[PDB]
Structure formats: C-alpha cells, structure tokens
Design a binder for this molecule. Sequence first.
Ligand code: ADP
Ligand code: ADP
Ligand code: MG
Ligand code: MG
Lengths: 509, 546, 462, 22
Amino acid sequence: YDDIGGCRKQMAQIREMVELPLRHPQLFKAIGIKPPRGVLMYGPPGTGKTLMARAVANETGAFFFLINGPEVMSKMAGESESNLRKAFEEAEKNAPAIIFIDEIDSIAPKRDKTNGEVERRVVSQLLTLMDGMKARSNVVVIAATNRPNSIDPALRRFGRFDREVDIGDATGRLEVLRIHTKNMKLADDVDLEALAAETHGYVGADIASLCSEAAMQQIREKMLDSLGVTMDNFRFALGNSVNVTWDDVGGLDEIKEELKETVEYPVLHPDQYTKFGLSPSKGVLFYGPPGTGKTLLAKAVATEVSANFISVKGPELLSMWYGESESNIRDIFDKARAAAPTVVFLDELDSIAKARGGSLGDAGGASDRVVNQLLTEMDGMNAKKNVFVIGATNRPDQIDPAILRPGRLDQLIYVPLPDENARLSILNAQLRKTPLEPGLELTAIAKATQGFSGADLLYIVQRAAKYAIKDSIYITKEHFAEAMKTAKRSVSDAELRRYEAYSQQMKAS
Amino acid sequence: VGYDDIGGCRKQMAQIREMVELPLRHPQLFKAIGIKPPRGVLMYGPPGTGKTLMARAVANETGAFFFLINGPEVMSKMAGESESNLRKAFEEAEKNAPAIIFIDEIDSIAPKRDKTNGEVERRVVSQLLTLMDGMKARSNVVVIAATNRPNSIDPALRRFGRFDREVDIGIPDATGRLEVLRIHTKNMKLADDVDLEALAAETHGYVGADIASLCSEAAMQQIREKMDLIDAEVLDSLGVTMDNFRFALGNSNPSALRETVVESVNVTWDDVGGLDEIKEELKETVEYPVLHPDQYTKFGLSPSKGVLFYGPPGTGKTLLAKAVATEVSANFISVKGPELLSMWYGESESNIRDIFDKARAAAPTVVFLDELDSIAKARGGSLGDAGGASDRVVNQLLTEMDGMNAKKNVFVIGATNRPDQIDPAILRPGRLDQLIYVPLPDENARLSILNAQLRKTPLEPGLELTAIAKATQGFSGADLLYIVQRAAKYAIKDSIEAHRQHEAEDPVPYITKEHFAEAMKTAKRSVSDAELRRYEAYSQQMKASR
Amino acid sequence: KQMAQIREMVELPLRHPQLFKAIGIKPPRGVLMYGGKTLMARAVANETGAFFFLINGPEVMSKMAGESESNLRKAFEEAEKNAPAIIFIDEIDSIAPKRDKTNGEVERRVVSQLLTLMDGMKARSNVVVIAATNRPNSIDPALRRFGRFDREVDIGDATGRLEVLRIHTKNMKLADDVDLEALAAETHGYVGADIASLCSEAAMQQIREKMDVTMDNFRFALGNSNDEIKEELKETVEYPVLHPDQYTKKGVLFYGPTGKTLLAKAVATEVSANFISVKGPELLSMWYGESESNIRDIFDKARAAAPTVVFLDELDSIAKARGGSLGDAGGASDRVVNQLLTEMDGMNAKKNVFVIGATNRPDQIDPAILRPGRLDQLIYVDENARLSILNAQLRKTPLEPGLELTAIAKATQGFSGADLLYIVQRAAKYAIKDSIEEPEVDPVPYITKEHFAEAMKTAKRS
Amino acid sequence: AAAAAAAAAAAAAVAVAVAVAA
Ligand SMILES: Nc1ncnc2c1ncn2[C@@H]1O[C@H](COP(=O)(O)OP(=O)(O)O)[C@@H](O)[C@H]1O
Ligand SMILES: Nc1ncnc2c1ncn2[C@@H]1O[C@H](COP(=O)(O)OP(=O)(O)O)[C@@H](O)[C@H]1O
Ligand SMILES: [Mg+2]
Ligand SMILES: [Mg+2]
C-alpha cells in the first residue's frame, strides 16, 4: 500500500471492501448481509490497476492468480472454456484468493456484434462460473479494461461486476515520484515540483520507466560514493507538448493579462470559487488577420497551467461518410474531458460552423449535424468539469449566433495587428538564445515594417539565420540589411478594413 | 432458497410450479383426463430477473432428482464427445427416479443451424433435438431451460414436445418490487424510520439483483459511516437508516440502463427562474401519470406523452431538461443530436430502436431528444444521399414513437432552435403533443432568474437586483449568467489583490455594487433582432393556427 | 560499436554489481541479438569464467508432460544458484511463436513459464540473459516488454572472417601459395556456414581438377558461389545531415522539362543513407482516414528509420493546389494536403528526414506547400546530358563499333531520358526482328546504324 | 499398444459489410 500513489479514494474503497470480509466476518454476520464480490476496473492502459490488485493480494493472505485475455483464448473448441474452468477450480480449491482477469473486453464481444462461436461460448462460461448454483464460495473477482462499454450487460450485473471503479493528478504524480524513488539516494538539490509539473500527461506506468532510464543513463555517463541522478539526467529522461513559457509572444499585454486571469484563476483557487459558489467562464474566441499569433497565444496560455493541449484543425475532421465527423468531434471532446484540466484549440470555426442556416443539400445537412454535435458537446447534457474551448478563425461573419452565445464562446476577443512597440517585443522574444551583435538596432528594423505580421518577422529571422549559416559554412548587421529588402507582407488591406468593421460592429452591439 | 425466497413474479411461479409438482404429486388426475402433461419450459427475459433462482428453488423443494447442465461445459474438441456428454447426462437422469434437467444458457449450445459455419455445433444441436424428441424420447423426465436471447435459437427447438411453453420472466411491477425489498431485507437489522413502500414506489426499473445491490450498498454505506466514526457493544448499535437507503438509491441505477447513465448534475426547480407556467405544465404532464394512474384508468384515457421546447438559444430548455432529470422519479435517457448516427447501413435505425426498446422496457422513462434539427430535419430532401438515410432515420423514429407498440409511459422531451425545419409528422399530436415556446424573459422573469442564479453566494445586505433586471430589456439567461460571472471574477480578483497585499505587508467576503457596475459596462445582448423576428413570426403563425 | 556495447553490457553489470546497485538502476538483465551472433556468444562465454548454461530453442521439449516448465525452472535456478552468470537462449523463434498465429497449448505454457521466470529475477540474482534470433519480427511484444528485453543490438567483419577461415581450413593439406587475407577481404556478406561451403567447394573443384587445393580453386569457388547541380545537391544534403554544432551556433523540389527521377535514383543509390519512395497518387483512398492513414504511417516509417529520404514523385498529382473544387475529390484533396502539411511541419531538428519532390508542371503545385519553413529549395533542371544518358543506357549492350551517338544527341534537342530509352528499346526490337528473320552464333551480333535510323523514325517527345 | 485419435475443431471465416457515404 506504500507503493501506490494518486488512487487514494479507490484504493481505500477496494482495501476496505476486501479486508472487512477478511479481517472479521463477524461484522457482516451481525449486519446480516453479504459483501460485494466483483470489481470492474476501467481506465487508460498504464495506470496501475493490477499493481493495486497485487498489493491488496499481497497485504492480505490471498492468492493472486493472473488470467490474461488473449492468452486463454484458443482455436480448439471447448479448450478455452476448459482453461477457465480449471483456473476457477484452482482458485477455489486451496484458499480464499483474488482473481485478476486482465483485458476482459477482448473476451466479451457483447454476443451480438461478433461472429465467432468460441467467444459467445466463453462469455457464457464466464457468466456460469461467476453466478449460478454454488457458483462462488468466498472468492472475489477483479477485472481490467480500457473501454467498459464493450462488455455484456449480464456481465456488468450485480454479483459478477457489481462495482465499477474509475481509475483515471499533480499530487498523486508527486506521490508516485516519491514512492518510485524511495530505494535510491538521487541527490540533495533535486526538486520534484518541476518533475511533477512538466510530466502532465504521464499515466503512472511511464514514471517508473522514466526513473529507471534516468538511473541507467547516469551510470552510463559515469562509466560507489556520491552516486545518483541529477536534474540533467531527468531532463534527458524527459527528452527521451509545446515549448513556450509566457515569453515567446510579443505585445498584446491586456489580452495576455485577460487570458492569464481567466485561465489561472479557476485552476489555482477552486476553494474560493466554491466559497463564492459560481462556475467560471470557459470559451475564448479570437478573430482577425492571419499570421497574428492566435495559435502562439493559445500555446502560451496553455503552457503555464498543468493542463494538456489538444489542437485540432478545421477541415481535418470532415468526412465523406455518414456520422464520421460527429464521431470525431465526440472523440475529441471525450479525450478532452477525460483528463482535467485540458484546453481545447478549435481552429477555423468559419470552416466548421458556416452559420448553418439552410443549404438544401447533403453537405449542408452534414454541416448542420456537425454544428449540432459541437453545440451539444460544448454546452449540453454534460458536467463541464474542466474544459477550456478556445476558438481561432479569420471570418467571424460566417458563425451562427449559437456558438457565440454566452457559456460557449462568450469572450469575443479581437486580435489586432501589432505595432512597432509590439514588434520590438516580438523581435526580442524570437531572438532569445541567439549570439547578437552590439551594432545592430532592432528599433531601426521594426520602424520600417508598417503593417507586417509575426510570420513575416519569423521569415526575416529565418533568412538572417540562413545568411548566418551561409557565412559560417554572432549574427551580423549586413544579413539584416540584405534580408529587409525581400519582405513579403502577405496580408492585404481589404481584410484589415473588414476586420475593423467587424470589430466596430461587435463594439456597437 | 425455497419458493418463499423467490418473489415479485406470481403468474410465472405458478406456471412452473404446477407443471413440475402436480404430475409428480397426483398423477391420478392426468390418468383420469387422459392427456399427458407438458414436459418442457424455456425461461427467458432480461438478465438478472431470477430465472436461476427459481430453478434452484424448485430443485431444492421438489423431492425429484435434479441434474444441472451448463452451456459450454459439455463442449469439447474431439469429434463426437459433446454429444456423448449430452447422452451421458440424459441417460443418467433417466436411469433414476423422475428427474428435472436444467440447461442453463442454452443459447450458447444451440444457435440456428443454418447460420453457423462450424460442424460440432450443428451436431450438438441435432443431438439435443433427437434427445428431447425421438423414438422413446422421455419418460417422467422434465427439461427446463434459461436464456436471454430467445430469437437466437433454432426454431426447430421452440416446438411442443421440446419446449412446450416459453414463460416470460420479466421485470416486476411496483408491488413486485415491494415484495423483493421485503424478501431481501428480512435478515438484516433495520431501523424503524425507513419504510420500504416509499422505496418500492420510487424505484421503477430495478429488477431483482438490482434490489439486492441496493440493499447491499445501503448496508455497506451504513457500516462505512459508522466504522469511520468509531475507532462487542458496537454490534448492538447496528441499524440501517432511511438516509442510507436514500444514498444508495440516489447513487444507483437499473442494470439495463447503467451504460446509458448520465453524469450527475445538480439542478432543482428553484434553480430555474421565470417560466413558472411552463414549469408547472411540465410537472403536471410528467408526475400526473406516474403518481396517479388510478384516476387515469378510472377515466379510461391515456396521458399526453411528448413535449417540444423551441425558442432563442440559451433561454433554458436544456436547463429544464436537467431539472426534470434531477427532480422526477422516472428514469432519464439523454441523447445528443447526431449521437445515434453511424456510417454503416441500417445501423442508425438500429441505434434508435435499441434506445427506445430500453426506454419502454424500463418504464416509466423520459427520453430527452436534444437538437432534433439533426435527426428529424424534413423528410423528402434533395434526393440521393442528402435524404437517403435522413429519411430512414425519420421513418424509424415515427414508427417507434407511434405505431404497433404497447403504451408504456415513455415521455419524449424535445429541444430545437429552428423548429420550422422539423418534419411535420413528428409535430403531430400523439407523438409530440405540446408545442411550448420558451420566450426571452421579461423584466420580472429576469429578476427571478437573477435571484435564482444568486441563490447560494454571499451578498451585501443593502444590495438590490431590480436595477440590474430592469437595465437589460433584451437579455437572456445566458447573458445574465455572463454578467454574474464577470462580477464574480472582478470580486475574486479584488480578493486575491487584497490577500497578496496582506501577505506582502476575509477582506471582501461579499460582492459589491461597484463590482456589478464595473462588470456590467461590457454586456453582450447575444440574440440578434433578426432571430427574434423569425421566432415571433413562427410563434404568431402557430397562434393563428390555434 | 556493437561489440563495445555488448562488452559494456556484459562487463559492467557482471563485474561491478555493487556500483550498479549504488546507482539505483536494476533494468539491465536482457540483451537481444537480431540481424556473428553465435560467435559473439562464444566469445562472451570464453571471455568470462562465469557459468554458461546454453539452452537452444527446440531442445526444451520431452516426452514427460510439464518437462518444459521443469527444464526452464531447472536452468534458471541453476544459473541463479551457481554464480552471477549469463544464459544464452539461441533461436528464440521456436520457443516464442508470437502467441497469436500459434494454436497449441504447451507452447503457450512454456511461453508463460519463460515470462514468469524472466520476471522473477531479484537484485541478488545478478544474472543476465542473451538471446539470438534470425528474424526480428516473430517475437512476442510481451517478451519485448519493459523488464525482460529492451536493449537489442543490430549486428548488420573481415577480421572475424579471416579468423573463421583460419579455423576451418587449417585441417587440410592446403597449398603453398595462398593468401587468406585476400579471401577475407573479397568475401563481403558470408557468415559462418558460407565460408565452410566455400572451402568444401574448393576441395570439390580440386578433386575435379585432379581426376580427369591451390589458390585458383578457392578463387573460382568464390566466383561460383553466393555537374555543379549534382555537386550542390550532394554537398547540401551532406551538410544538413552532418554534425549540427555549426548550425546550432528540410526538403527540396525539382522542376524542368532531363533526369529528375534519374537524379533521385542516384541519390537513392550513392548517398549512404536510407531511402523510401512512393508514386504520386499511390497513397490515395476514396475513404475518410485511409488516404490519410497511408501518409501517416509512411511518415511513421520515415521517422522510425532516421535518417531517410522520402522521394515524393509527381507532387502536383498529390497537392493540386487545394484551393476550391467543391466535391468529394476536392474534399479528399484538401484532407490529403492538410495531412501532408501537418505531418511535414512537425519535423524538428531531430529525426532529420528529407523530402525530395519532382514534377513536370510546377504551376499546379500548392503555394501552401511551396512556403518557406516547409520546402523552400527550387532546383531548376542538354546535349552533353543527352550524350551521357545515351552512353549510360548503352553500357551492357553489344553495340556496333562503327557508330557515333553524337548525331542522335545533336538531332534530339527537347527530348528526355524516357524517350531515349524508348528509342534504344525500339532499336533492340528491330535488331531482334532482324535476328529472328551455317552462320555464326548471331547473324547480327551488334546493333547497326540502320536499326537506329529505323527506330528513330517513330520517336516523339514526352 | 498405443492408439490414435481424431479431432476437427473449427477454422476462420471472412465477412463483408456495406457502408453508407454522404
Ligand atoms: N500509483 C502507482 N504507484 C507506483 N507505481 C505505479 C503506480 N501506477 C503505476 N505504477 C508503476 O507502473 C508499472 C505498471 O503498472 P502495473 O499496474 O503493473 O500495470 P499496467 O501497465 O497494466 O497499469 C508498475 O511497474 C508500477 O511500478
Ligand atoms: N507577438 C508575436 N511574437 C512573436 N512571434 C509572433 C507573434 N505573433 C505571431 N508570431 C509568429 O507568427 C506565426 C503565426 O503563426 P500561427 O499562430 O499559426 O498563425 P495565425 O497568427 O494566423 O493564427 C507564429 O509562428 C509566430 O512565431
Ligand atoms: Mg442465471
Ligand atoms: Mg441548451
């Protein structure tokens, strides 16, 4: 029990539901009822479910017998059922033991979608061995799966799998780091806060491999006193999901402050919001010219929280089949709300929503169905635990007045074109780790822009780096002097007037 | 477990009881009437109703020999061994006194012969057929079966002489659930406060093992709450309160619908402001049939089932759906708009029919069809695949909501945003009776909405919301929620500022008038005037039809 | 490098166990050998005085039921009981049948026994396992899981070949004028048994010589057994994949009327790097997902075998400048272009992939794919190249001696290498017709000028 | 004396499904 971290409430529930029959059956004799005899474990692969089952089977005088999914299945008729019967008879002969049947979703095809007879036969064998006449005599079974919906409804019944445990945070990840680094002296100046904040997407089975790879790489690079891993070993282990920290974006100080507030406040102080008793805002919508920094702003507001980042594109979800785009939308929102917190970045809302209205065609009906699926997944019959939908389009006039409703995309934030004082910060943020010359003036480069974009400034920096690597095979001033002439200015003038008219209409509303 | 243990199903119990007992007790009557009794039963129904329990009960009570056969236990790999096992079982049973045979989960042994590829399954099916019917088939030997999928059995097996009568062991009624609770709660020490009648009335779709799970969970909750409070005399003070059962019931759900369970969201009738008339009409329409069926059967009419909310976005239709799901006794089945569709052929309709089958099985039930604009549309589109599946889905919806079914208290709740695009056959009475329009709240309605939203939060004693309510005149409940959110955000920003200043060197345990004033200067008024024109036109057209 | 790696992996966890424990890592215990693996195993067994319980694959079964599991437990307990040692399991493909294609039950039982015996090694065991295999694909992933086998070597030499030669051929009355260094040098791909077959065939040819072993017997026993554009292109390719320290302190496109696919073939042959090529519409599928899954797993195969070259031939057919088409083909083109852009822009300085494109029409390529940051180079691609193409196509050909190709080079101006190959093939067809229509072995052994002058009659431009 | 035994269990088949586009 000292080797389990993060699964506190479910570990305590499983511990009590196993040990209260095992420590004293006189309590259940006095209360006059039978304890539950089934645990259905579900969650992502690599969480630690079989480690908890083995820990409960080790701390109590049981016998942990492991049954695998694809191992017990065979092509011979009546042999896999014979193997299941032999395993249940072996578990019932010697002692009260703990059965862990792993990957039960492979041997439960719900008896209607499958075509093989052996799968339905072993399903019926499991329902017979778990419930029936003198079915079980003081023995509890444990399961493990990834998708608990592809199980039989008679299998998810009382008496077989009567308890369903959701084994899906930062303090638990720090506990796993503390219990996985317990039998080795790593160092004195290693702080686990960065190791618990940077590995925001580790399930729990990768942390042990991370510590083992760091401890292997330290001895590999050091080949008995004063041994152990340091911070650079953990950095190399993490190197073996974006790399920004509030610094790569230039300008837009009030927009950065507003995003920082409306993202960091519901994360850092949940207790103050439960004291106030109100739910925070979720949706932010950006609009304006392309090449402005909306994706960079989304990455810069996602990188400081302990949330994930699911950045999907506009036209990378529509399909020619019937229902495939809505299934992809539902899968994206389920993967978003299955790991809290998580900021979602929907790009090209003008390509997704299209302001459904009426088209009278197959593509129009598919667009209507996509819009209704998005409207149901954002604010419908959900719990909205921790979902931060952030939109980014370049055509806000083709959006229906249902996603712009408050509660879904209420923040109508306009992202304008930067100025020279903002382009100074962009050029200072792009040249962070670059050998610079004291004779170059970034102010003289930024004054001669007059309506450039972040993509154009990145193109100028890339041309300067190409000229630097051409001169090599610090950065000099003549590279900037020869790269400033070949500018692009990909953004035209009429889109800026249209965006300013849309912003003025949104302000006058 | 005897006959007393089995409860909640009296007709089926008598049906098996008489056949299994009376011929073995007084065969003089059969000799006098000159007809042999039926000698075959196939018990079917949803999983977990008590089929195996009744089989165990009759086995333990009757003095006749009982032989148990499991489904896959007889199958083997060698050629000609499973049939040998069946022959051995039958001959052993027939060698002794009159006996009962029980083939549990027969649907695994004997699927339809024409639709199988193997050979051993066909041979064992034929062996079952020959054993039960054939030259000198049986003599004082009774066969009983149990299955969950009767239709997936060889039709040659479903004939007189093999399985004479197929008894339907289905879900029990309110009284049946009452006896199930009384049976299960007979050994555990109960507290006087809890009354099982109210619990039986509250539970609707729970069947058998579901009630057993409820009782076990309530006992476990009582133990867990007492075990943590305390560190011989403890045994005496072991009593399960009504609160334990209420906790278990709130945390539970029937097995058939467990996969369709919805994440719990806390909303109550007072949490929705305004719309008092619509709220009362919905409450009447919902709890009238379920709480008082005696009056409806006395008057000899059926109740209105369907309802449709339409109006501007955000006004509170999905909120009303949440409120219903929280504050009605009937089971809830939520569905997104296009959630049921699929790419395959003939699967979106299978999806619709399965959800409706589950709903009408676990009646009474409230099915909330959200965003009908996707599923319904208008039949007869622009030809080709633009309508090819959109028409089949609509036809399946029509024939499932009304036609060739038994009225079983299934209330469909609709929610749309552009109802003019809905197929007119769906809107017909008997499918969606009520056409409720949920308009933008007026001044007093907005005041009620604000008071509802601000129910649980600190407020300044000298603070009034009438100015806020009156200073909008065009807003929606979502917009008022946005105003409240901005006010709360500014207040908590001020609180964090004060806390940081105090740390560097409750300051504000309430929201202020200046907080509201600062937050309100940037409002939205999301619903445009063209959408309002469209909705007003549709509503006045409806009234003109009225 | 592989010998130094296996020497470290067999020395450092076998001589300094205390240091390994002090470090705090207990993972090294299993080494895999795919691809002189048995020679390395014998050198390991003869370089250490530790215990060496060799167990081959199919030598684990016995008439007694359950003997396999008892034999595995006996070997593992003997290796744990005697000393910190090493176990050699040769030909693991017989014991582990990959568990999915098999249908037996004692194979599953012996695989489960090997799994539960490899996992049940504690810190006080201090034993490692070495395993050799032939194919690197028929192995259980449960055997390749983290804990048993994670550190595999890829043994893909002349000194060992000379050692094997001096081991084998030293037991015969050989010769007096032999140099085995030349036999070790000229033999490149032989392993283990092919040198023994070489010596056996040398003895057989010596016996055939003195019936009707010198150096010539081994010799024929081995023989009877088994400009500025290309300069800039090669230099640039070499520099990008070279050390990145200077850079710290990918793509290309061909266009023209000439040898673009010839230049891609010359890159694919003589660059000393990997190469993966697909056709233009080869990666298409009228389905949502598949036509993108092909490009996804193509780039997964590219990033797995780093470094590599992904030669996208006929880019226009794939990209088509997605723009607006408003159909099912337009939607498939837009999804293909979006998959290509989102699976090419995600290439960092790591994994160093390189996409090579070629086209005839550069007008119809997408400017979203000609953007900077994804694919910025533009290599524009005569008489001398035509003469070189005609001389490279006629390498292994019995040409007539009185024939000059400068007339064909000067007459054909705007032609291409494919139609030059068509001209040569029509000349070969005319020569074959003349041949099919006592003389010598061939009445027309060489292709005359008349065959070329008749084959160029029906020659067009591409 | 020894003896033999016959056994024939099953095989694996392939089905075909129909899809709907839009
Ligand atoms: N909560 C945890 N505490 C400590 N180690 C954990 C935890 N969860 C997972 N692990 C590690 O992850 C590895 C895999 O977990 P395990 O439960 O054995 O299997 P699975 O990969 O199926 O989840 C184990 O070796 C264990 O050390
Ligand atoms: N304020 C900024 N500071 C630095 N770089 C910026 C800034 N704004 C834009 N950029 C650069 O411009 C590019 C814009 O790309 P992207 O965010 O995908 O497009 P868009 O701005 O149209 O949403 C980014 O790669 C980023 O490096
Ligand atoms: Mg049963
Ligand atoms: Mg709603």
